[PDB]
Design a protein around this ligand. Structure first.
Ligand SMILES: Nc1ncnc2c1ncn2[C@@H]1O[C@H](COP(=O)(O)OP(=O)(O)OP(=O)(O)O)[C@@H](O)[C@H]1O
Ligand SMILES: [Cl-]
Ligand SMILES: [Mn+2]
Ligand SMILES: [Mn+2]
Length: 436
């Protein structure tokens, strides 16, 4: 179960799961992946490539051009995102080779995908290669890089500033700044823009659209959440790292809060720092970081949400997939305890795909026997669940013509953590849906 740093053809045999852990910038995505795919084609395997984002799935369509690779938005090598793969498993192919790039991605759909894949491997039905510089259990925040990095611990602004921090804005290059949340990024970006900087903001909801702006000369800062840890390539000379994240936590099975901001894992710190130092002929890149790392605890909601997904994915007769073993200890939930019957399972999937709700919240609503289009639960919760914005209680016109206070029966802090999330949830609660 030890990671390797070189691909060999014998890794493609069934029952092998290999972790390829070359350091950041070493060429996993653009040079090792095409070598694996060529070998999979020559041995006539049924192969799927899993990219963390549609952006990366484009960086692969280019590093694989000329090969029979077919990108799938929802012989021939299949290419899709982690989320697309898990979404397809939740719907009513039998690959024998799974290649997952950026296999450190900790979103529930990626965790679930690794659990399903590693289970197929242990069943003797497939081989798999997990590519990541930071596999689970990474404890080194400062891995190798193509060019040496200047690491400096410094106080990193956590809110807008009106003076001081001259080192932030006196820089003449391009900076990638990792923030713990969209709302914190909004405040940092506005402060930078007031200083005359050209700022690009990245988050999960906006990444596929806004990342293209970074491919141009005309920007000074990218202000990004942890989504840029997943193989986002920048031409930057500096990373500023809060070393902070938010952690969704299920409190007593009752609600989801956003805990923190609190220290990132070593893997996240290494991936953030790994955005620079990538040009072997360009010394002098800087990594300015604001605190220490800490390891995830038993209570990060994403691993329990991954079990909610896997309990509802068909495997083989009555079997359910386990989590990938190095992550299976992050969850106390019993295999199968979140399995839904057929009609509630359809609602569960619809609330996630069409409703844009977090997994945990979708599960609560679906397992209560609520159908997808019935939005009464958004308004009948405890007054403690009242959603606020601008310190006034949030209100919504329902399609029935009633103006109701947003007061969901189950409280998931992710539906109201920033303006974009709240806008989406208000439209959901009103029975509307933005065109996407
Ligand atoms: N002159 C250059 N030509 C090509 N690549 C370069 C050059 N200078 C720097 N690089 C960087 O080296 C990186 C190595 O490519 P690749 O994405 O395959 O590495 P990786 O192992 O996938 O990294 P990560 O662990 O961060 O996902 C490129 O993404 C690119 O950003
Ligand atoms: Cl985000
Ligand atoms: Mn190297
Ligand atoms: Mn990569």
């Amino acid at each position: 179960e030890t990671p390797v740093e070189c691909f060999e053809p014998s890794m493609l045999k069934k029952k092998q799961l290999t972790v390829l852990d070359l350091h950041p910038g070493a060429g996993k995505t653009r040079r090792v992946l095409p070598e694996i795919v060529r070998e999979a084609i020559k041995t006539r395997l049924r192969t799927v490539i899993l990219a963390p984002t549609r952006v990366v799935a484009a960086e692969m369509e280019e590093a694989l051009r000329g090969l029979p690779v077919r990108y799938m938005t929802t012989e021939i090598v299949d290419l899709m995102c982690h989320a697309t793969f898990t979404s397809r498993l939740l719907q009513p192919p039998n690959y024998n080779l799974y290649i997952m790039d950026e296999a450190h991605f900790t979103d529930p759909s990626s965790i679930a995908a690794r659990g399903y894949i590693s289970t197929r491997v242990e069943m003797g039905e497939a081989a798999a290669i997990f590519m990541t510089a930071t596999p689970p259990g990474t404890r080194d925040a400062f891995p190798d890089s193509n060019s040496p990095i200047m690491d400096t611990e410094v106080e990193v602004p956590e809110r807008a500033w009106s003076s001081g921090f001259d080192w932030v804005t006196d820089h003449s290059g391009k900076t990638v700044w990792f923030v713990p949340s969209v709302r914190n990024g909004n405040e940092i970006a506005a402060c930078l823009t007031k200083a005359g900087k050209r700022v690009i903001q990245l988050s999960r909801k906006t990444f596929e659209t806004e990342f293209q702006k970074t491919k141009h000369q005309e920007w000074d800062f990218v202000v990004t959440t942890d989504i840029s840890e997943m193989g986002a390539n920048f031409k930057a000379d500096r990373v500023i790292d809060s070393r902070r994240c938010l952690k969704p936590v299920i409190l007593d099975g009752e609600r989801v809060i956003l805990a923190g901001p609190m220290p990132v894992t070593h893997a996240s710190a290494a991936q953030r720092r790994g955005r620079i130092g990538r040009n072997p002929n360009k010394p002098g890149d800087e990594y300015l970081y604001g605190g220490g790392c800490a390891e995830t605890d038993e209570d990060h909601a994403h691993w329990l949400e991954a079990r909610m997904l896997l309990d509802n994915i068909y495997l083989q007769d009555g079997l359910i997939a386990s989590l990938y073993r190095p992550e299976a200890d992050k969850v106390a939930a019993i295999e199968g305890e979140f399995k839904l019957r057929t009609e509630q399972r359809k609602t569960f999937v619809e609330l996630m795909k069409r409703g844009d709700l977090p997994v945990w919240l979708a599960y609560q609503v679906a397992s209560a026997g609520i159908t997808y289009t019935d939005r009464r639960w958004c308004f009948d919760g405890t007054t403690n669940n009242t959603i606020m914005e601008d310190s006034v209680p949030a209100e919504v016109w329902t399609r029935h013509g009633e103006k109701r206070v947003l007061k969901p029966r189950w409280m998931d802090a992710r539906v109201c953590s920033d303006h974009a999330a709240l806008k989406s949830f208000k439209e959901f609660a009103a029975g509307k849906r933005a065109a996407a």
